[PDB]
Design a protein around this ligand. Structure first.
Ligand SMILES: CCCCCCCCOc1cc(O)cc(CSc2ccccc2C(=O)O)c1
Ligand SMILES: CCCCCCCCOc1cc(O)cc(CSc2ccccc2C(=O)O)c1
Lengths: 334, 321
């Protein structure tokens, strides 16, 4: 996989490359945009396409599968660039975030998101325009992205001022909304709504469905895969929330640990939480951290056991030895 | 007409419905709606709608089902326009757009949302086209037209943003310290480059796309598309240049027509010390626009050798308005 990279980068660079001085500057820039942001990640989404396809093969077919696999990694790159803009991040994959670079800046990074994003659909035209799944593939990418955009919306706004059912001041361009958690949003239903949309569709559903469509599978097994994907996304974002404890607390994010602590702590501790969650002051966080007291460590281990079981149960009702093997596999390496 | 402007709520609500069919909780769905209805309303309405009407005109030159599909494409262009405006304002750090505050400036919105909202508006387009034209034979071609124009636009934007920048000289992935102070580069101050920028940044999506949209839906592939591409390239220029004439362009260190015309014509070049912060008085110093508009209008009418009385009429018409 990691070998095929240059081929797809260059095919798109080629597309762009049809005044000479200008063409040359464009290339130096866009090659870096690709290299800087597409390489360096673990590539789980990418390999998943290749694995699922394999288990459901001449060189031409790999060419097409590896294309889809790389298009996922591009999508990922686009999301990381955008998310770092939005969250005002510092570090990503142990380098500076793209937008932070003096030769890049926020102005270019925005434009670059749209570029990466659209690059995907061009590469799919180059390699799969004639395949019968073509239209379905481009649709999968579109629908997964839309779901991701909504999941991102929610994650950004769940505790925000705009969330009665007061509307938006199209005249207030000044003053800020003193980041303040909203106890009404601190429940599992909402969290799942965010986590499923923000991560499950593009991290699991998309790659699997890509590998399945190319292979010729529409059939009632896609909805089975959607549900497994929903389950995996949760299992997994929640894992991530467990680690980012050992910026989210100051970044005022809805996390699993936050919700578990809330449904579990005494009416007086809930108030401490509200006074310290998301605020700048270090005493405030050193303290949420100490509330995590309710042995969140242990409550995770309990959830991981139970959720892993829910995931395996749904996989065994799939009736496809090849896909079952891959998903059992990914659930070990995820 | 304002028949077009009437169809608006239908397409906005179709896409809002799509969202409202997601696996979410009712309270959450309600907030989502409130927000996205505003994103559409605030950014899609208020414009002149030339790109929109162009689709409807070209197509016309018809039962209700056909309008439904053509007005879809027409609105999709206006949504595209909305997304480009939102994005451009973030990039150029703008203040006012259509005589209100820019979307991203709003305290309930901020840069963090606006970015995400550009992607949402953009993708909304392709969903609307699935809804209204999934079964049409031109479907695949239509979605590609939108894709290719966007890509050209994106490149045009890249150029417009960077033509005078530090990296364009005869990238440091470790420098994150406030950017270099902006300086024009005399090497870039020529017509070739400017047409490169203006063609890509505006011509494909403002002219080519809406015309090709009206053409594909109508059943025209044929060798007349490349004719339309060229007219479209020409109009793009004719028109960005007009906008340069009305023109914070000097202040924003932008490559403009007046800048290039003055440069090829003017010790005065050493412009370099004041552009991007008297430039104004260098312009009244050196009428040349009125000369170009007469010549370019002629070049455009001459190309409209199209052999199609219906299309020719509309293009002659748009060139007036
Ligand atoms: C339109 C707005 C875009 C919204 C998209 C939000 C993106 C955040 O969702 C994520 C959540 C996670 O838990 C993990 C990851 C990637 S794994 C990863 C993580 C860090 C570094 C490298 C990698 C790597 O393997 O490539 C993504
Ligand atoms: C993602 C890459 C970023 C893309 C950036 C593309 C730049 C888009 O900005 C513009 C370009 C133009 O050539 C003209 C206009 C104003 S026309 C207009 C203005 C306000 C209302 C209605 C209209 C109308 O003619 O319908 C704006």
């Amino acid at each position: 996989f990691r070998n095929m990279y240059d081929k797809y980068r260059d095919a798109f660079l080629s597309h762009l490359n049809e005044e000479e001085e200008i063409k040359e500057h464009i290339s130096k820039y866009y090659k870096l945009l690709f290299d800087y942001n597409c390489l360096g990640g673990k590539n789980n989404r990418g390999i998943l396409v290749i694995l699922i396809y394999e288990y459901v093969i001449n060189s031409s077919e790999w060419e097409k599968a590896a294309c889809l696999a790389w298009c996922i990694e591009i999508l990922q790159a686009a999301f990381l660039v955008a998310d770092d803009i939005m969250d005002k991040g510092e570090m990503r994959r142990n380098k500076y975030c793209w937008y932070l670079l003096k030769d890049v800046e926020t102005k270019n990074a925005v434009n670059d998101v749209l570029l990466l994003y659209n690059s995907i659909y061009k590469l799919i035209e180059i390699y799969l325009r004639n395949e019968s799944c073509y239209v379905d593939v481009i649709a999968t990418f579109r629908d997964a992205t839309l779901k991701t955009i909504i999941g991102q919306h929610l994650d950004t706004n769940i505790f925000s001022d705009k969330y009665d059912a007061r509307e938006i001041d199209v005249n207030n361009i000044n003053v800020p909304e003193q980041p303040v958690i909203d106890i009404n949003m601190i429940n599992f239903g909402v969290y799942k709504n965010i986590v499923i949309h923000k991560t499950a569709y593009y991290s699991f559903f998309l790659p699997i469905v890509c590998g399945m469509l190319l292979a010729g599978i529409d059939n009632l097994i896609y909805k089975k895969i959607e549900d497994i994907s929903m389950l995996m996304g949760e299992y997994f974002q929640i894992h991530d929330d467990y680690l980012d404890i050992f910026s989210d607390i100051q970044n005022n994010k809805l996390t699993w640990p936050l919700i578990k602590t809330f449904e579990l702590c005494s009416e007086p501790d809930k108030i401490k939480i509200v006074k310290n969650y998301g605020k700048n002051n270090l005493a405030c966080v050193k303290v949420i951290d100490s509330l995590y007291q309710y042995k969140i460590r242990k409550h995770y281990e309990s959830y991981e056991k139970a959720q892993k079981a829910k995931i395996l149960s749904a996989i065994n009702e799939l009736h496809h030895e090849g896909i079952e093997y891959v998903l059992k596999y990914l659930l070990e390496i995820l």
